[PDB]
Subunit: 190 residues, 3 copies
């Protein structure tokens, strides 16, 4: 099956992705941003070198890069999970991290939203930073906006909208990760 996987940044989504790729063989976990960056360097090497450089392309070139990345991802046969962000915050507001062509090419079966507790998000972000400074309301608003984006994409393309709740206190560290991964594989095997 095919699912997009999303959530606010810095909350532990990458750990979920890697522990999924670790605890299932018939699975492919890919990052839309990584494929976008690869296709960009291959088509526009004279300009691109790091993720940060993907901003300098015009919106038409960036759209074509997203389209080609979605295509290359489309040629995957096994159970697929596409890690990405539905919305990202900017000085102008929330900007969608996807485009309708992405979904109608990848044609995923569903969209999975990892909804964490804002306090936990702040804690994880601060920890990883010691290795942006939002508040609880900012993160809650971001998650509700992501809900709305997912529901819009679903209404347009008719797909599933799974909301995985990780807003409960962990009994042991990294438990949210295991709960998310176990429920995701339960979905994949049914």
């Amino acid at each position: 099956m095919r699912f997009i996987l999303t959530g606010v940044p810095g909350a532990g989504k990458t750990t979920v992705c890697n522990k999924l790729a670790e605890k299932m063989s018939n699975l492919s976990v890919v990052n839309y941003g990584d494929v976008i960056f690869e296709e960009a360097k291959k088509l526009y090497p004279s300009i691109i070198q790091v993720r940060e450089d993907t901003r300098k392309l015009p919106r038409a070139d960036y759209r074509n890069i997203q389209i080609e990345a979605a295509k290359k991802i489309s040629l995957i046969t096994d159970n697929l999970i596409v890690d990405t962000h539905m919305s990202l915050k900017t000085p102008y507001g929330f900007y969608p991290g996807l485009i309708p062509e992405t979904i109608n090419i990848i044609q995923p079966d569903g969209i999975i939203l990892l909804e964490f507790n804002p306090r936990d998000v702040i804690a994880r972000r601060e920890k990883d930073r010691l290795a942006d400074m939002e508040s609880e309301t900012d993160i809650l608003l971001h998650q509700q906006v992501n809900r709305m984006f997912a529901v819009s994409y679903s209404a347009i393309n008719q797909c599933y909208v799974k909301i995985i709740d990780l807003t409960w206190p962990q009994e042991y560290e990294f438990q949210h990760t295991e709960y998310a991964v176990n429920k995701i594989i339960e979905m994949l095997n049914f």
Copy 2:
């Protein structure tokens, strides 16, 4: 005045639809789900024998039976209410009951959303279950919120009304919620 009536399952939507069909003249109350089930069954008599078996069909064939159901119920003239669910929950999450083709084929004027109180919903569901006629507060409220989002998206795309009848208040007597909703819908139709 053709409207799409929706709400979380097991809360009282069907009683509202029935009392509408009984109290309103020149009003056709049609169940999108039953029509889809019938059409799918008759066009694929081998693979389809229960309602939720309609998920095995490939994307194209399911969308085609939905298109045929929408065309069939669009032929109805005058005023009609379409009983249906805007989203149903499954092991894979929330799944929509409509598609843009369905909406612009039925070309409805508005979408009515019956938003109940989750406690009332739990009570109704269990009372029905005990009578052999067939989630948590948080889950029900999330379902209603995603239904609201779906309805707003459909309205933004097709330009239609989004009526939200709020039955979250405690009843003073049985069937007060459904009576209030039916009367609001009838004053809407007559307006």
Copy 3:
């Protein structure tokens, strides 16, 4: 850059618009409804005496009037702020204040939503009723519902056309009068001049 400023009516949106016009140079602030009314009067002077008379129209002609108003608004060159509504409460429910033709013709860089505290909304509605004209009055929950529906409309237009969705929070309590207006104007200006 082009932004569509919106929010529930009677809460101070036009105050923000007029003060933006008064503070920042090279900023054109246009009211979609005003343009629509002018064009309606132009093409149908036999029926349109005032704004509400626009209900007399059939929906197709009014939609085309909206399209012509959006066209005229798109002809503007520099920084633009289109004051309008994402939804309107009617007997039949919420109706979108925009149409897809508006989004496509204006190509707005973003949408902006002023989210108020319903108490302030009600108080300002009743005050502007007292001190002047503007002859179904809503409640707190109704206003919250309206704001959430507008948020959903905005996210939908963004997901469909890929534009920004800025939410300016004016829910906190004002320490002095018109503080929300100053805050909204300052934030919109900071956003426009961002480099």
